Design a protein around this ligand. Sequence first.
Ligand SMILES: OC[C@H]1O[C@](O)(CO)[C@@H](O)[C@@H]1O
Ligand SMILES: OC[C@H]1O[C@](O)(CO)[C@@H](O)[C@@H]1O
Ligand SMILES: [K+]
Ligand SMILES: [K+]
Ligand SMILES: [K+]
Lengths: 301, 300
Amino acid sequence: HFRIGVAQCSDDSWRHKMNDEILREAMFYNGVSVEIRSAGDDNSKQAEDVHYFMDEGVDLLIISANEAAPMTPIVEEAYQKGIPVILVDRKILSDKYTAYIGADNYEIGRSVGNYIASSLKGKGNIVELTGLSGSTPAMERHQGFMAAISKFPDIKLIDKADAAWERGPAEIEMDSMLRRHPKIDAVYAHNDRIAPGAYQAAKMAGREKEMIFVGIDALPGKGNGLELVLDSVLDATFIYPTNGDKVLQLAMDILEKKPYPKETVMNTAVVDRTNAHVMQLQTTHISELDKKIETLNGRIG
Amino acid sequence: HFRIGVAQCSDDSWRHKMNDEILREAMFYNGVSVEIRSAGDDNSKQAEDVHYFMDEGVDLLIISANEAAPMTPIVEEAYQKGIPVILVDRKILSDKYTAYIGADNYEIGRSVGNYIASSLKGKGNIVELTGLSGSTPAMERHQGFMAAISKFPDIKLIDKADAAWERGPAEIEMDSMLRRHPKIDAVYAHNDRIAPGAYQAAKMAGREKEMIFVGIDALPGKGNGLELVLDSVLDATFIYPTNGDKVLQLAMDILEKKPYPKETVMNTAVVDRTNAHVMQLQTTHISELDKKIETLNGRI
Ligand SMILES: OC[C@H]1O[C@](O)(CO)[C@@H](O)[C@@H]1O
Ligand SMILES: OC[C@H]1O[C@](O)(CO)[C@@H](O)[C@@H]1O
Ligand SMILES: [K+]
Ligand SMILES: [K+]
Ligand SMILES: [K+]
């Protein structure tokens, strides 16, 4: 009845959570088939996945653009070929798409800069470990953060490196920063996978108590951001919401020719020591309501 | 297949949430029938309800003993007769029962005490408005509180009254306290219904900015504790969880002759300005996962 293609820039616990949220919302609509592919952080594979979804003539395309520039031509094709395109989370560099949904990455950066400036009482040295440079969240996470800390002449960005969203490059790059900078008061990590990597670099150099750690994503579950705050590894992290259900509702509104917003902006919030506990109690319950919905879906058919 | 009778002491938004969770959890077991009654805060009516559940031969009894003494023989009776009894939230005076489930009312009390002492920097006058004196949560919430504030020589409890769990008495009692006490630094309310009562008495006397208000329950939804924090009426409230799902799973474990603990202590946490936002984000997401279950359950 309706087939949807999800072209996803990568695969990890954040994507996993969004995917499952989409599929879970699918079963509330009669007919709809959702197919999902990961690009494993590679622009070619993501083209291949988009071309694949175009060959299969899917009714709608959901994509998160790995890097902005290289993927622009490829999304434009799907658009001129008449297929409706939903951009999630990451953006492209033109307006040739049907609808955008995501959280404001610039404002998150701004929030990160303000939180650090407040915590360091207006004075200190920050190092930044970014996501993949050409992706729109890494760009904006940096811009917003620079905008915020410009208002504090004694908060200084003294080093920056591209960690490609991952813990591996984060560790090496943080090693280089520690070696070259005796005074570091804060690490700004673009996600909660970069963050533990930098921390482990600091831990191992006997210097993790000299600085605060800030990340983005704030997922519940083992190995994720919330847990890192509760474990006193991260001082703060910002909710980067997956909202898989609202993504599918958008798809359905478009397909079923219901009205829709062309742009849906989602909110963030800071998560830290003061609020990590109540958040965990609540997400723990969410997990339970989820497996209830999965048990209840299995009993149908 | 199995019949469970639930003898609730009260009816209100807190009880209703637990009642809904219990019913929703029962949909997941085959042939489990749950009948829920409210005593309307009356011991005789609650005695009747248990007696009724006994007469129709329920397989298990869930009870929140309105007051502890009046309800002990009745519970002791249903137990010796061989019906398993689950005590929820409130307790009776003796140990003769199958299992208890609730949160730690004493430690909630202690947390309130610590929170007020910290917020007032170890100096100030507190008024306390208790739940129904003869109920165990009210005894325990007061006693935990005394334990905490005993460690601060400059914190005084200057007045105390039995607000009987409700806004009405709370508002009259606060009113009196305000007239006799020119300096009040904090109000300790035993629940999120007593608190807005105390608050309105203060607001109407032009004094709400002089003190902090601390409550218990911290429920989501219009007119409850989370909203009161969000709206800056309540400075803090503590989570007193309902977890009707856990309550019914405990019933099923006993009836299915599966292993179960006699004592189940559930989690509390403080809710205030610093966490109310992520709190409400999560509950708002929880609330629609419920509508997503009413839909699915209502397609079977
Ligand atoms: O789009 C940026 C987002 O991508 C992720 O790496 C998920 O793959 C997140 O950690 C980050 O917030
Ligand atoms: O058992 C004490 C609890 O009972 C209630 O009054 C609801 O009936 C709550 O407000 C309070 O926390
Ligand atoms: K600066
Ligand atoms: K640290
Ligand atoms: K106040």
